[PDB]
Design a protein around this ligand. Structure first.
Ligand code: HEM
Length: 147
């Protein structure tokens, strides 16, 4: 798992992407955009997005809700990453929050490489890009266990 320094560095580099209400939504939007471009069939699995296509999903109201809650969840896990017990608990709950019968463990897990590339591209440098991957590779399976 992340060392204290890796957590600090990642928080620093993600900070300017997760500060303002707008940036928090913006960050989440990009992640889902990447996800739906690779897997447009996942769109209909998000209840608020039903009927949208990849052509128009980014303009829905629903995607802003999802964008906000995604960014918030990622940041929350990052902030607790040095608390083994807490991050495990938070991660498990976020997995459980994926109640929809439309989403499976395997579908969830397929988002890992996509979110990894996205967040790596979003952060500034090599040290942050490596920390992103270590961070996501660690937390994806934690959440998926409860899906
Ligand atoms: C970094 C990894 C992820 C995190 C932290 C995350 C977080 C969340 C959170 C917090 C919610 C609840 C939002 C609410 O109603 O309050 C949610 C919903 C959802 N997520 Fe994720 N998610 C992640 C990855 C994915 C992936 C890759 C998929 C695609 C398989 C996915 C599919 C869904 C679906 C279908 C919902 C339910 C939308 C609803 O019921 O309205 N998530 N996600």
């Amino acid at each position: 798992t992340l060392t204290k320094h890796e957590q600090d560095i990642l928080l620093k580099e993600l900070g300017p992407h997760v500060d303002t209400p707008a940036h928090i939504v913006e960050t989440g939007l990009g992640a889902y955009h990447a996800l739906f471009t690779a897997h447009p069939q996942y769109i209909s699995h998000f209840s608020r997005l039903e009927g949208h296509t990849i052509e128009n999903v980014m303009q829905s109201d629903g995607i802003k809700h999802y964008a906000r809650t995604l960014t918030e969840a990622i940041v929350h896990m990052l902030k607790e990453i040095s608390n083994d017990a807490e991050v495990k608990k938070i991660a498990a709950q976020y997995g459980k929050d994926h109640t929809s019968r439309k989403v499976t463990k395997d579908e969830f897990m397929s988002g890992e490489p996509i979110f990894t590339k996205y967040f790596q591209n979003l952060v500034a440098d090599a040290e942050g890009k490596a920390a992103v991957e270590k961070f996501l590779k660690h937390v994806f399976p934690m959440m998926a266990a409860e899906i």
